[PDB]
Amino acid sequence: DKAKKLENLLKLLQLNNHKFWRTQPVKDFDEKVVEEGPIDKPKTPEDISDKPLPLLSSFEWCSIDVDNKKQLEDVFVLLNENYVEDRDAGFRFNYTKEFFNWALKSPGWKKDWHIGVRVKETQKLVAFISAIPVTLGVRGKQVPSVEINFLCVHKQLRSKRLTPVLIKEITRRVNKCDIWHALYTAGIVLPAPVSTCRYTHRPLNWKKLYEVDFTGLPDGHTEEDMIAENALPAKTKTAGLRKLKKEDIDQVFELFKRYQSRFELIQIFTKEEFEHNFIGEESLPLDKQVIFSYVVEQPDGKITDFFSFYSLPFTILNNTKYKDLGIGYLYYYATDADFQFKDRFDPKATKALKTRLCELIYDACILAKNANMDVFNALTSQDNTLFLDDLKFGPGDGFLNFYLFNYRAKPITGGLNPDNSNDIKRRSNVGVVML
């Protein structure tokens, strides 16, 4: 009743170009957090069933092996054909097998949790729902959990109220393994964001981006002025910048730990799931390479800085010139630039971190460009708000809502000022980066 009013103002907020959750362990819109913790009363793996939920006649569940060749393919057919909301938008997600070999083969992954739904006779995958187990860090407290991603239902049967059962099953499949919480992120407004960030875009090939109608021409600007505006150099600028390597880890894992700890919602990385996350499947041609990791090694051997980014390209339709779009997304980064200071928000410690973040992420743009990326993405999350405006990361209209399943939390800052502008003042406290 009051929660509906708040939902509207929040939806009104994000506006641009509940029979299920009404019975789920989530924060409601009105609810002011008294104490951070579990919603649902403490349950046990035996209090939770072992029956995969029955679904409408003609369907069945299916576990999907990422090691299996044709199983993985089914997914990145259905996702590619259906993930794009509009069928006429003239672009599609192109999830490649190399991509899911990274994102679905998580250390601690179990093919049982890469749930799917098939049609009985035809063996046609019509829905997929993934979950990969991680340990979170909600304001100082260590919450062992799981990340739910890649929810998707076949165009031809939406409004079929199947997503509930898809969430309800993964709920059960996780629940029986001694895990009862989750991080999950959506673009649409659901009952109880802990935070919201905003998508932003950095041209790398503006000439192209225009010719595909992903960016336009502002009032009183030549097609030329814009080319000259976003133009980048060929070589990365900052001293001793190198690709991440097996040996770097223990120095980087410390650097990333010390840095990441400032945020209120981080993933606790175990040195092994960190290594799986930042070193990609070895030997892959430049157009297949999923993850891109980089690190600064001082002359002595000290690793000062670290950044990484992942490629998820679109396929482009109805365009003679171009067949697809190279899309890099900024990921997890680190730097010691503000370590000597006591306070993160000390104006001198902020200017010290900033001018570093400008350099490192400027060099990221060069590198992404060099890997044949057209547009480099980054949210208003983390300390990102420091460089975005300076590095021509013009605003995008996308809003990412971060939600926690079965855990109360007071609003974590997202890097947005109430008027949707970038919050240069307080930055952001969101530490995790979802896909």
Ligand SMILES: CCCCCCCCCCCCCC(=O)SCCNC(=O)CCNC(=O)[C@@H](O)C(C)(C)COP(=O)(O)OP(=O)(O)OC[C@H]1O[C@@H](n2cnc3c(N)ncnc32)[C@H](O)[C@@H]1OP(=O)(O)O
């Ligand atoms: C402890 C661990 C337990 C694990 C559980 C973790 C819980 C977290 C799980 C959350 C998943 C993480 C999300 C990601 O991974 S994000 C992935 C979202 N993906 C996309 O938007 C692109 C592809 N989209 C599709 O295929 C669409 O058809 C979707 C699937 C989005 C809607 O499909 P459809 O149009 O056919 O809907 P329905 O009739 O079957 O079902 C209607 C109900 O579903 C609610 N709905 C609609 N969209 C979403 C959405 N994106 N998240 C959560 N809920 C959503 C909706 O409010 C309604 O419920 P209620 O509002 O009436 O109650």
